[PDB]
Paper text:
The oxidative folding machinery in Gram-negative bacteria typically comprises a soluble periplasmic oxidase (disulfide bond protein A [DsbA]) and its partner membrane protein (disulfide bond protein B [DsbB]). Together with a quinone cofactor, DsbB generates de novo disulfide bonds which it donates to DsbA, which in turn oxidizes unfolded or partially folded substrate proteins. In the present study, we demonstrate that B. pseudomallei membrane protein disulfide bond protein B (BpsDsbB) forms a functional redox relay with the previously characterized virulence mediator B. pseudomallei disulfide bond protein A (BpsDsbA). In B. pseudomallei, deletion of dsbA has marked pleiotropic effects on virulence.
BpsDsbA in which the buried active-site cysteine (Cys 46) is mutated to alanine (BpsDsbAC46A) was incubated with a synthesized peptide of sequence Gly-Phe-Ser-Cys-Gly-Phe derived from residues 99 to 104 in the predicted periplasmic loop 2 of BpsDsbB. As a result of the active-site mutation, BpsDsbA cannot resolve the resulting intermolecular disulfide bond, creating a long-lived homogeneous complex suitable for crystallization. GFSCGFBpspep makes contacts with each of BpsDsbA's four catalytic surface loops. Its interaction with BpsDsbA is anchored by a central disulfide bond to the active site, and the flanking hydrophobic pocket contacts both Bpspep phenylalanine residues. Specifically, 102 Cys of the B. pseudomallei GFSCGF peptide (102 CysBpspep) is disulfide bonded to 43 Cys (2.04 Å) of BpsDsbA. 102 CysBpspep also makes two main-chain-mediated hydrogen bonds with the cis-Pro-1 residue 159 Val of L2. 100 PheBpspep is sandwiched in a pocket between BpsDsbA residues 176 Asn, 177 Ser, and 178 Leu (L3) and the side chain of the active-site residue BpsDsbA 45 His. Similarly, the phenyl ring of 104 PheBpspep inserts into a small hydrophobic pocket lined with BpsDsbA 73 Phe, 77 Phe, and 40 Trp. BpsDsbA-GFSCGFBpspep superimposes on apo WT BpsDsbA with an RMSD of 0.3 Å over 189 equivalent C-α atoms, and the catalytic surface loops are equivalently positioned.
Numbering used by the authors:
A (entry chain F): 99 to 104
B (entry chain A): 9 to 197
The structure:
């Protein structure tokens, strides 16, 4: 999928 | 057609304490002001949370993936401490994602929010208060307890996680969230 992850 | 466990949502291995009052289903959105996916999702999750009404206890938890964005977590709880969250948050998002004003320092935030009718003195006090410091530190601890790796992540009754990382669409995230809450209410999850 997609997402802001860090 | 129903969401698939382990694909459209994740059954957490270590479920978390639930603060909802029995009748309600708990719903937690781990979000970040700077995430454009959380930005575009704001109207969808809002309208839905309002549609459930008494049936859920919804809350947000700001996520700071690096120290750069801790001020965004302090911003979230400083506005809530003032009771202006629902009023200024649309302006906060737009400032970040349209006005090239990322609000990364308390001064820039106090400057922006004063155009929205918020007294600088009162905002900075909440920003620097120990109560907001404690809420920020607790939100980072919730990030680990819920094993949150990205935003926006939605947790239902502290057991099931979903979001665009699983569904690959905001609409799919809303459909999964709606499905999980109903399954909880029918004692199937």
């Amino acid at each position: 999928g997609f997402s802001c992850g860090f | 057609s129903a969401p698939v466990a382990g694909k459209d949502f994740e059954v957490m291995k270590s479920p978390q304490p639930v603060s909802a009052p029995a009748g309600k289903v708990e719903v937690i959105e781990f979000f970040w002001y700077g995430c454009p996916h959380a930005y575009e999702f704001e109207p969808t999750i809002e309208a839905w949370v309002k549609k459930q009404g008494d049936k859920i206890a919804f809350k947000r938890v700001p996520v700071a993936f690096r120290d750069d964005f801790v001020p965004h977590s302090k911003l979230f709880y400083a506005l809530a401490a003032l009771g202006v969250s629902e009023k200024v948050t649309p302006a906060v998002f737009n400032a970040i994602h349209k006005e090239k004003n990322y609000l990364l320092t308390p001064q820039a935030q106090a400057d922006f929010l004063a155009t929205q009718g918020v007294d600088k003195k009162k905002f900075l006090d909440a920003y620097n208060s120990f109560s907001v410091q404690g809420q920020v530190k607790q939100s980072a601890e919730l990030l680990k307890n819920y094993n949150i790796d990205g935003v926006p992540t939605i947790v239902v009754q502290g057991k099931y996680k979903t979001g665009p990382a699983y569904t690959n669409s905001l609409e799919g995230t809303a459909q999964v969230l709606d499905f999980l809450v109903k399954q909880v209410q029918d004692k199937k999850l």
